[PDB]
Design an enzyme around this catalytic site. Structure first.
Site, PDB file in Angstrom:
ATOM      1  N   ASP A  10      -6.011 -36.422 -17.565  1.00  0.00           N
ATOM      2  CA  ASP A  10      -7.113 -37.285 -17.240  1.00  0.00           C
ATOM      3  C   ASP A  10      -6.866 -38.545 -18.073  1.00  0.00           C
ATOM      4  O   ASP A  10      -6.990 -38.482 -19.276  1.00  0.00           O
ATOM      5  CB  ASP A  10      -8.487 -36.635 -17.632  1.00  0.00           C
ATOM      6  CG  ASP A  10      -9.655 -37.509 -17.184  1.00  0.00           C
ATOM      7  OD1 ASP A  10     -10.767 -36.972 -17.045  1.00  0.00           O
ATOM      8  OD2 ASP A  10      -9.437 -38.749 -17.049  1.00  0.00           O
ATOM      9  N   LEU A  11      -6.518 -39.668 -17.445  1.00  0.00           N
ATOM     10  CA  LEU A  11      -6.123 -40.859 -18.282  1.00  0.00           C
ATOM     11  C   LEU A  11      -7.329 -41.495 -18.965  1.00  0.00           C
ATOM     12  O   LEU A  11      -8.425 -41.416 -18.444  1.00  0.00           O
ATOM     13  CB  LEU A  11      -5.423 -41.887 -17.399  1.00  0.00           C
ATOM     14  CG  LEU A  11      -3.895 -41.658 -17.485  1.00  0.00           C
ATOM     15  CD1 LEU A  11      -3.361 -40.288 -17.802  1.00  0.00           C
ATOM     16  CD2 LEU A  11      -3.105 -42.333 -16.401  1.00  0.00           C
ATOM     17  N   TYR A  15      -8.642 -48.143 -15.410  1.00  0.00           N
ATOM     18  CA  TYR A  15      -8.482 -49.585 -14.937  1.00  0.00           C
ATOM     19  C   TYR A  15      -8.324 -50.511 -16.175  1.00  0.00           C
ATOM     20  O   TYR A  15      -7.571 -51.487 -16.163  1.00  0.00           O
ATOM     21  CB  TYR A  15      -9.662 -50.074 -14.069  1.00  0.00           C
ATOM     22  CG  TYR A  15      -9.794 -49.444 -12.684  1.00  0.00           C
ATOM     23  CD1 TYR A  15      -8.898 -48.446 -12.249  1.00  0.00           C
ATOM     24  CD2 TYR A  15     -10.844 -49.824 -11.831  1.00  0.00           C
ATOM     25  CE1 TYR A  15      -9.027 -47.829 -10.977  1.00  0.00           C
ATOM     26  CE2 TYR A  15     -10.974 -49.263 -10.514  1.00  0.00           C
ATOM     27  CZ  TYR A  15     -10.060 -48.299 -10.115  1.00  0.00           C
ATOM     28  OH  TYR A  15     -10.196 -47.715  -8.914  1.00  0.00           O
ATOM     29  N   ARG A  47     -16.853 -49.296 -25.618  1.00  0.00           N
ATOM     30  CA  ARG A  47     -17.746 -48.140 -25.745  1.00  0.00           C
ATOM     31  C   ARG A  47     -18.362 -48.024 -27.161  1.00  0.00           C
ATOM     32  O   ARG A  47     -19.512 -47.559 -27.293  1.00  0.00           O
ATOM     33  CB  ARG A  47     -17.070 -46.835 -25.328  1.00  0.00           C
ATOM     34  CG  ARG A  47     -16.788 -46.794 -23.825  1.00  0.00           C
ATOM     35  CD  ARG A  47     -15.909 -45.650 -23.432  1.00  0.00           C
ATOM     36  NE  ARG A  47     -15.169 -45.920 -22.180  1.00  0.00           N
ATOM     37  CZ  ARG A  47     -14.692 -44.962 -21.390  1.00  0.00           C
ATOM     38  NH1 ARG A  47     -14.921 -43.672 -21.689  1.00  0.00           N
ATOM     39  NH2 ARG A  47     -13.982 -45.287 -20.294  1.00  0.00           N
ATOM     40  N   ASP A 102      -7.020 -41.304 -11.314  1.00  0.00           N
ATOM     41  CA  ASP A 102      -6.482 -41.034 -12.648  1.00  0.00           C
ATOM     42  C   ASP A 102      -6.513 -39.638 -13.204  1.00  0.00           C
ATOM     43  O   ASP A 102      -6.213 -39.445 -14.425  1.00  0.00           O
ATOM     44  CB  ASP A 102      -7.197 -41.949 -13.646  1.00  0.00           C
ATOM     45  CG  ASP A 102      -8.469 -41.317 -14.191  1.00  0.00           C
ATOM     46  OD1 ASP A 102      -8.638 -41.513 -15.402  1.00  0.00           O
ATOM     47  OD2 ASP A 102      -9.243 -40.588 -13.436  1.00  0.00           O
ATOM     48  N   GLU A 103      -6.703 -38.674 -12.320  1.00  0.00           N
ATOM     49  CA  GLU A 103      -6.661 -37.247 -12.711  1.00  0.00           C
ATOM     50  C   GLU A 103      -5.618 -36.530 -11.852  1.00  0.00           C
ATOM     51  O   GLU A 103      -5.434 -36.889 -10.658  1.00  0.00           O
ATOM     52  CB  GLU A 103      -8.033 -36.601 -12.467  1.00  0.00           C
ATOM     53  CG  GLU A 103      -9.090 -37.121 -13.464  1.00  0.00           C
ATOM     54  CD  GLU A 103     -10.437 -36.478 -13.180  1.00  0.00           C
ATOM     55  OE1 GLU A 103     -10.514 -35.291 -12.748  1.00  0.00           O
ATOM     56  OE2 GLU A 103     -11.433 -37.136 -13.422  1.00  0.00           O
TER      57      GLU A 103
HETATM   58  C1  LIG Z   1     -16.513 -42.493 -11.036  1.00  0.00           C
HETATM   59  C2  LIG Z   1     -15.721 -43.743 -10.724  1.00  0.00           C
HETATM   60  C3  LIG Z   1     -14.459 -44.098 -11.288  1.00  0.00           C
HETATM   61  N1  LIG Z   1     -13.834 -45.254 -10.885  1.00  0.00           N
HETATM   62  C4  LIG Z   1     -12.521 -45.681 -11.397  1.00  0.00           C
HETATM   63  C5  LIG Z   1     -12.596 -46.418 -12.777  1.00  0.00           C
HETATM   64  C6  LIG Z   1     -11.726 -45.573 -13.736  1.00  0.00           C
HETATM   65  O1  LIG Z   1     -10.878 -46.417 -14.583  1.00  0.00           O
HETATM   66  C7  LIG Z   1     -10.974 -44.531 -12.829  1.00  0.00           C
HETATM   67  C8  LIG Z   1     -11.024 -43.119 -13.503  1.00  0.00           C
HETATM   68  O2  LIG Z   1     -12.422 -42.680 -13.570  1.00  0.00           O
HETATM   69  P1  LIG Z   1     -12.871 -41.779 -14.887  1.00  0.00           P
HETATM   70  O3  LIG Z   1     -11.738 -40.906 -15.439  1.00  0.00           O
HETATM   71  O4  LIG Z   1     -14.256 -41.150 -14.878  1.00  0.00           O
HETATM   72  O5  LIG Z   1     -13.203 -42.943 -15.999  1.00  0.00           O
HETATM   73  P2  LIG Z   1     -12.122 -43.603 -16.985  1.00  0.00           P
HETATM   74  O6  LIG Z   1     -10.620 -43.322 -16.762  1.00  0.00           O
HETATM   75  O7  LIG Z   1     -12.209 -45.127 -16.764  1.00  0.00           O
HETATM   76  O8  LIG Z   1     -12.718 -43.387 -18.497  1.00  0.00           O
HETATM   77  P3  LIG Z   1     -12.443 -42.061 -19.422  1.00  0.00           P
HETATM   78  O9  LIG Z   1     -11.565 -42.475 -20.600  1.00  0.00           O
HETATM   79  O10 LIG Z   1     -13.873 -41.665 -19.773  1.00  0.00           O
HETATM   80  O11 LIG Z   1     -11.709 -41.038 -18.552  1.00  0.00           O
HETATM   81  O12 LIG Z   1     -11.741 -44.506 -11.605  1.00  0.00           O
HETATM   82  C9  LIG Z   1     -14.495 -46.090  -9.952  1.00  0.00           C
HETATM   83  O13 LIG Z   1     -13.911 -47.166  -9.620  1.00  0.00           O
HETATM   84  N2  LIG Z   1     -15.712 -45.810  -9.449  1.00  0.00           N
HETATM   85  C10 LIG Z   1     -16.328 -44.681  -9.755  1.00  0.00           C
HETATM   86  O14 LIG Z   1     -17.441 -44.467  -9.264  1.00  0.00           O
HETATM   87 MG   LIG Z   2      -9.992 -41.042 -16.867  1.00  0.00          MG
HETATM   88 MG   LIG Z   3     -11.708 -38.681 -15.112  1.00  0.00          MG
END
Ligand SMILES: Cc1cn([C@H]2C[C@H](O)[C@@H](COP(=O)(O)OP(=O)(O)OP(=O)(O)O)O2)c(=O)[nH]c1=O
Ligand SMILES: [Mg+2]
Ligand SMILES: [Mg+2]
Length: 373
Positions: A10-11, A15, A47, A102-103
């Site tokens: 999970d990155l 973005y 954050r 990103d997962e």
């Molecule tokens: C839930 C969600 C994520 N995204 C995009 C932005 C994120 O960079 C990417 C991955 O989502 P996530 O893994 O939830 O968020 P993240 O990678 O930015 O932060 P974290 O370190 O907490 O994992 O998906 C959207 O564009 N819209 C959405 O509704």
């Molecule tokens: Mg992520």
């Molecule tokens: Mg995620």
DNA sequence: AGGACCC
DNA sequence: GGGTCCT
């Protein structure tokens, strides 16, 4: 083929990570990626200052006035890096399932077993964990499930190191016996860390959740339903009447979510491979008069054509999606779909015109190519 | 065509 | 602003 070792990767702030790599001057600065009025994600510096994921720009700049915002409406570069990550993981073991950009899940069971058959009846006692053990649980080196999960933790650390060394990206990983638990455990230590779940701590992890919506698989609507039933904690769900649940959510939804409430989840990691659809979107609140705007449709098309091309395969269906204004009618987009003529597969003007008629059949315009072959 | 889920 | 699979 009973016991599995699964990793969920999970990155970190995906973005924002990509934007920080593009513009090094955004490093150590608080950064938000904006789409329209939303700060869809932000780096970890942001954050620390109060900025949350999916916060509107207003709230976000009055929690953090010095927030650098970059526009993230064009997903091209995020999408490209996302497939680079999946491909790098596929090189470890081929069965990789994506979830969002990103997962990824990888089924490491075969890899773990081949590594174990490689070690002698001596170095098995030297097997060590890489990263965190959920709930600080003691390892039992004579427990074969513990040994396999630890070898899974080592593979995971190799994956995260390769991602960093080859693509410059940091991420978390969780290692567990199924996808539900790997995904729940990956988020326990963040950013840029990994955790493994031993079987004895599975109830502890499931009960650490504060509402059943936190269970991957239970969404906005099912959670609203469960509530109506007096079901709020994971335990409420675990103990609730299977029969009432069955004859209320369908047998399908009921027996699966109840299993999830126990930590149980037999779903296989599915090879995602190439995408099943390609779409692009445009939002504008009140801006689609209902005639003037097809210039927009031409724009969506021109981008898409370049992508759908690039891929090698070709789409045999086109779809047009719209949304309309007024009051808070919380769901309701509309679409018209038709096959693409075989002449036009083997470009713009005939596509524009298929689209326009579909338009005539019918805040947001999108186009989606699907049914790729 | 649309629903529900996911990020 | 994307994406998946099911009804
Ligand atoms: C839930 C969600 C994520 N995204 C995009 C932005 C994120 O960079 C990417 C991955 O989502 P996530 O893994 O939830 O968020 P993240 O990678 O930015 O932060 P974290 O370190 O907490 O994992 O998906 C959207 O564009 N819209 C959405 O509704
Ligand atoms: Mg992520
Ligand atoms: Mg995620």
């Amino acid at each position: 083929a009973s016991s599995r070792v699964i990793v969920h990767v999970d990155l970190d702030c995906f973005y924002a990570q990509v934007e920080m790599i593009s513009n090094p001057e955004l490093k150590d600065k608080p950064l938000g990626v904006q789409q329209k009025y939303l700060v869809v994600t932000c780096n970890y510096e942001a954050r620390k200052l109060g900025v949350k994921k999916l916060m509107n720009v207003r709230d976000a700049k009055e929690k953090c006035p010095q927030l650098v915002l970059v526009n993230g409406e064009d997903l091209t570069r995020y999408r490209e890096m996302s497939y680079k990550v999946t491909e790098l993981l596929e090189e470890f073991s081929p069965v990789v399932e994506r979830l969002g950009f990103d997962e990824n899940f990888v089924d490491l069971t075969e890899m773990v077993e081949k590594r174990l058959q490689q070690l002698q009846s001596d170095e098995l006692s030297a097997v060590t964990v890489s990263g965190h053990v959920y709930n600080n649980q003691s390892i039992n080196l004579l427990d074969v499930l513990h040994i396999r999960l630890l070898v899974g933790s080592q593979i995971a650390a190799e994956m995260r190191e390769a991602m960093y060394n080859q693509l410059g990206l940091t991420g978390c990983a969780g290692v567990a016996s199924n996808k539900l638990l790997a995904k729940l455990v990956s988020g326990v230590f963040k950013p840029n860390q990994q955790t493994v779940l031993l079987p004895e701590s599975c109830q502890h992890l499931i009960h650490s959740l504060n509402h059943i919506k936190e269970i991957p698989g239970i969404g906005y609507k099912t959670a609203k339903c469960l509530e109506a039933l007096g079901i709020n904690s994971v335990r409420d769900l675990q103990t609730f009447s299977p029969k009432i649940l069955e004859k209320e959510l369908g047998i399908s939804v009921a027996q699966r979510i109840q299993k999830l409430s126990f930590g149980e989840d037999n779903s296989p990691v599915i090879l995602s491979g190439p995408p099943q659809s390609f779409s692009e979107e445009d939002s504008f609140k009140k801006c689609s008069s209902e005639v003037e705007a097809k210039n927009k449709i031409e724009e969506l098309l021109a981008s898409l054509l370049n992508r759908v091309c690039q891929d090698g395969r070709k789409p045999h269906t086109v779809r047009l999606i719209i949304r309309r204004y007024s009051s808070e009618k919380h769901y309701g987009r509309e679409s018209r779909q038709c096959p693409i003529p075989s002449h036009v597969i083997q470009v713009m003007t005939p596509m524009v015109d298929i689209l326009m008629k579909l338009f005539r059949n019918m805040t947001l315009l999108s186009v989606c190519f699907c049914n790729l072959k």
